[PDB]
Design a protein around this ligand. Sequence first.
Ligand SMILES: O=C(O)c1ccc2nc(-c3cc(Cl)cc(Cl)c3)oc2c1
Ligand SMILES: O=C(O)c1ccc2nc(-c3cc(Cl)cc(Cl)c3)oc2c1
Lengths: 115, 115, 115, 115
Amino acid sequence: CPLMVKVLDAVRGSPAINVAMHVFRKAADDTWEPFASGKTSESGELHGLTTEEEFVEGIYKVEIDTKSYWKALGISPFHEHAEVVFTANDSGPRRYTIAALLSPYSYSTTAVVTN
Amino acid sequence: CPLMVKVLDAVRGSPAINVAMHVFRKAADDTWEPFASGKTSESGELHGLTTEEEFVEGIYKVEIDTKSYWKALGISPFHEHAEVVFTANDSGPRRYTIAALLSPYSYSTTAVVTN
Amino acid sequence: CPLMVKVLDAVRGSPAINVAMHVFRKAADDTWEPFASGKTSESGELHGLTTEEEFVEGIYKVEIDTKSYWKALGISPFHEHAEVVFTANDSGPRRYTIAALLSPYSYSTTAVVTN
Amino acid sequence: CPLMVKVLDAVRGSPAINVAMHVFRKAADDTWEPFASGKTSESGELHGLTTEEEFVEGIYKVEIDTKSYWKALGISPFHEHAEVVFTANDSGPRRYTIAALLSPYSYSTTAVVTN
Ligand SMILES: O=C(O)c1ccc2nc(-c3cc(Cl)cc(Cl)c3)oc2c1
Ligand SMILES: O=C(O)c1ccc2nc(-c3cc(Cl)cc(Cl)c3)oc2c1
């Protein structure tokens, strides 16, 4: 699993469950092409987005649908979504975890890149 | 001043100075139209992006060019930029402060919205 | 003003108003001695805690009473308080802004240190 | 495992390895009594701090030695340590994960409390 996403909720103190997300890869014409998508599990995780063969170097965007998550909880949010845009770089063996911590008017995101 | 941006550096413990950013507004055709741009001052603030008249209801995107900021400090960071996407002025005019706190592999953002 | 505190609320998207906090300074006997206290204003800021003369070198602790803040908003939060412990003025006088961003189960803090 | 700690590094984009931490429980005389301690693993985790029988309701403090972590990396940090102070409450079956994301001048912490 070269790419996985972990989403946490700072209001409930829990994983953020059933959060939809879309992953895009930047194409040659500078447009965002759909690459992978899914919904977070009961543990706030989304595994199986891609494979080592498919996940080549390039610029990727992970769009997390935070607005729909907060609306389903009956809480007024600020953001339309949270976006994480990064370049995947082959240095040596790398596994990427994108983590996000959500609040109605704020979000934080970090990357955990390991061998 | 209805839209202000404050950027802080979590490595140095300082305002993030000379950070470029571009603001876009979603048009009727679902494309991102350029709206305003500028760079942060010595206090890490960017003022005067727009006016109460021009800042109508809409979906806005603030793209903070964090990769250029870190590269100039000798750090190869994870993200291409930090993006803040939100609906503005849909319940009438509000004043928005978008704040961002930057690290090489992480960022946080929050909004302060006043009437 | 050599020591200022700014507190924001990530649920409401507003300054965190009327937040109490207590500042302590470590004494020679390794105990926390009371140093200053106050509460945040309508802008979420607390100014005038100390003076350049009184704010000598030392280890300081800023204890922000976040549990009382959330309880008054109808939220039973996770933390008792948010604590910020740091050495100040060990390379000469500096001006410190301690910022905190609050959610019911999370908090973030940063410092802006200027000469 | 009723209590575990996850520490991440926002400068390196990695787990924070070999971070020492101390857990204390508030005693009747309002003093902090040592309860458990250890150092984070290669995954930034610290497991086996306590057991379900020992981890009773009370006020706990997790002190993360961030200063020594940054000094070992040759980076000047702001904080002496990061403190997380909370009440453990029996509602139903609960497992607590305290997570922290570290930068030299900032830290963020959240709680993930699950069944
Ligand atoms: O000193 C001021 O005036 C000032 C203004 C805006 C501010 N936003 C923060 C802040 C933002 C994020 Cl996203 C996370 C954290 Cl920990 C802190 O600190 C501020 C300080
Ligand atoms: O319990 C786990 O396994 C687990 C994994 C990844 C995690 N990422 C965080 C985290 C992320 C941000 Cl952006 C801000 C903060 Cl305060 C915390 O906490 C985690 C916990």
